[PDB]
Amino acid sequence: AVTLDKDAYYRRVKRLYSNWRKGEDEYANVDAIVVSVGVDEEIVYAKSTALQTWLFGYELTDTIMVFCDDKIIFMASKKKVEFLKQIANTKGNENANGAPAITLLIREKNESNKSSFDKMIEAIKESKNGKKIGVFSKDKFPGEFMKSWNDCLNKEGFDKIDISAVVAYTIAVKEDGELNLMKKAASITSEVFNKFFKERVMEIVDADEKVRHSKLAESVEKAIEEKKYLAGADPSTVEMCYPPIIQSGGNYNLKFSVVSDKNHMHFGAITCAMGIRFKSYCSNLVRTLMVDPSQEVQENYNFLLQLQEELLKELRHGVKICDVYNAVMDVVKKQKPELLNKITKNLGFGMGIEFREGSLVINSKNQYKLKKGMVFSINLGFSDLTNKEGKKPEEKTYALFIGDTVLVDEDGPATVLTSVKKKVKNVGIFLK
C-alpha cells in the first residue's frame, strides 16, 4: 500500500550515474558503488540511509544496494523487495533510460544468504575494472545481516574508496518536492520557537524561576508531540534534528554537537538552537534572547545581524563557498577587527536529509561552488565577549549566536525559510 515515487527514483538514480560516469574526484576510479544498511534503532545520520531516502523516499534497514555499470542489485526482506518491485518492474514506461535495470534479491531470515552474496560479489567483479568499490566509510550498522555480508565482502579484498563528499554534492540540489518538505520543517521550527519556546523563557524570567537548560530542552522536545504547534502535520512525521541546545551564564559552546547542560538558566544572553526534521528533511534555527542588554551588547548583536545578511547577499549560485566566507570575514576585519578572534570559524553548512553536511561547511577552505536549489543552515556567532558591567561571574562573559535556514536562489540574495523576527525589539527582554 506504500507507494514509491517512481519518477523521483528515476530522476535521482540518473543524477547519480551521470556524476559517477563523469568521473571527477572520488568517482574517478570507482568500479561499483556498494551501500549497505543494517539495524538502526536510533535513526542516525548516515550517507547510506540518506541515499536510500533520496532514491526511494524511505530508509530500508537490513538492505544492500550494489550499483554497477550495467546492473543494479537491491537485496532486502520479501516485504521490502515487494515494495521495490514498483521501480524494478519498469512496465515499459520510458522514464527508465539513463540507469541500469534492477535485480532484486531476497534476504533469507533463517537460511544462509551465501548465494545472494555471491551474486553481488560477482556483479562487482564484472563491473568496470572490478577492483575498487565506492563506499561510505563512516557507516557501520549493527546486526547479524551486516556482519555476515561484510565478512563475505571483505574476503575479496576490493579497494575501498570513500565517496561521501562527491555523493554529498550530487544530492545537494533539492527538487521542488524536497524544498516543500524543508520549508514545512522550517515553519514548524519557527512556530515552536515563536509560540512555545519564547513564551516559556519569558515566563521563567518574569517569575524568577530556576530552570536547568536540560529541563528546558526537554520541554521543547515534548512540545512537538503536541499538534497545536505542528500546523496540520502528523505528529509521527516530526522529530528534533538534535537535542535542543540552550546555553547561558558564561558557559557557551556555539556548535550543534553538544547537549544542553544541567546548569540553571541565567538571565543575560541565552543562546537557543533548535531544528525540526520533517519527513526526514532537516531545518535549523538559532536565536539569542537577551535580558536588558546594554548598548554595547546590542551593538555587537546588531553587527552580527549585519554579517548574516552580508553572507546571504554573497551566497549566490556559481560562487565558491570559501569566497563567501572571505567576504564576510573582510567585513569583520574592516569594521570590527577586535572581533576577529571571537567569531565562529564556520559560518554554516549544507543541510538536507542529513542535518550537517561535512563537505559543505562555510569555512576558509571550501572549494565547492554553490548552486540554485541548495539549502543551508547559515550560522554566525561571537563567543568569549566581556560584559564590563557584569559583577557576578555568570554576568562577565556572554556570547551571541544566530542561525537561519536558507535557500540559494535563482538570482540574487539567498532566501530565508525560517520565520522568527530577531531585532533586539523581538529578542530582548526588558525588566524595568
Report the alpha-carbon angle 164-67-79, nearest 5: 105
Write down the number of H helices and E strands in the chain.
13, 17
Burial class (CB in 10 A: 0-12, 13-18, 19+), 203: exposed
84 close to 104: Cβ distance less than 8 angstroms = yes
275 close to 242: Cβ distance less than 8 angstroms = yes
Measured distance CA(32)–CA(54) in Å, rounded: 19
**C-alpha cell read off for 192:** 515552536
In terms of Cα–Cα distance, which of 191, 243, 229 is closest to 420?
191
298 close to 335: Cβ distance less than 8 angstroms = no
Report the alpha-carbon angle 262-241-217, nearest 5: 25
Q: Read off the amino acid at residue 207.
A: A
| Domains of the chain by start residue, with CATH | 1-171 (3.40.350.10), 172-432 (3.90.230.10)
Measured distance CA(63)–CA(113) in Å, rounded: 12
Backbone angles phi, psi at 60, to 5 degrees: -125, 105
Question: What technique was this entry resolved by?
Answer: X-ray
Resolution (A): 2.2
Q: In this structure, are strands 276-278 and 72-76 parallel, antiparallel, or unpaired?
A: unpaired
Of the CA atoms within 13 Å of residue 127, those in its CB half-sphere come to: 28
Measured distance CA(382)–CA(244) in Å, rounded: 19
User: Cell numbers 505528529 label which residue?
Assistant: 235
Q: What dihedral angle (degrees, nearest 10) is formed by the CA atoms of 254, 260, 263, 268?
A: 40
Residue 118's CB: how many other CB atoms inside 10 A?
Answer: 11
**Cβ contacts of 401 within 8 Å, gap of 6 or more:** 252, 254, 271, 273, 286, 288, 344, 379, 380, 381
Measured distance CA(160)–CA(173) in Å, rounded: 26
In terms of Cα–Cα distance, which of 204, 283, 248 is closest to 400?
248
Say how far residue 383 (Cα) sits from the centre of its chain: 24
In terms of Cα–Cα distance, which of 400, 219, 413, 212 is closest to 311?
413
DSSP three-state, residue 359: helix
Beta bridge partners of 381: 401
In terms of Cα–Cα distance, which of 46, 139, 14 is closest to 352?
46
**C-alpha cell read off for 336:** 570590527
User: Cell numbers 563512516 label which residue?
Assistant: 138
CA distances from 37 to 6, 131, 139, 144, 356 (A): 21, 22, 8, 11, 20
Say how far residue 217 (Cα) sits from the centre of its chain: 20
266 close to 394: Cβ distance less than 8 angstroms = yes
Measured distance CA(260)–CA(138) in Å, rounded: 26
Q: In this structure, are strands 397-407 and 375-386 parallel, antiparallel, or unpaired?
A: antiparallel
User: Cell numbers 536510500 label which residue?
Assistant: 52
User: Cell numbers 546555553 label which residue?
Assistant: 247
Say how far residue 410 (Cα) sits from the centre of its chain: 22
397 close to 384: Cβ distance less than 8 angstroms = yes
Consecutive H or E run containing 215: helix 213-223
HEC string for 285-316 = EEEEEEECCCHHHHHHHHHHHHHHHHHHHHCC
Q: Read off the amino acid at residue 129.
A: N
Residue 154's CB: how many other CB atoms inside 10 A?
Answer: 10
| DSSP state string for 367-412 | -PBP-TTBEEEEEEEEEEEE-TT--SHHHHEEEEEEEEEEE--SSS
Q: Where are the beta strands (DSSP E) in 151-299?
A: 159-162, 238-240, 245-247, 269-274, 276-278, 281-282, 285-291
In terms of Cα–Cα distance, which of 123, 178, 163 is closest to 35?
163
Say how far residue 339 (Cα) sits from the centre of its chain: 28
408 close to 372: Cβ distance less than 8 angstroms = yes
Measured distance CA(191)–CA(187) in Å, rounded: 6
| DSSP state string for 7-62 | HHHHHHHHHHHHHHHHT-GGGTT-SEEEEEE---SS----HHHHHHHHHHSS--SS
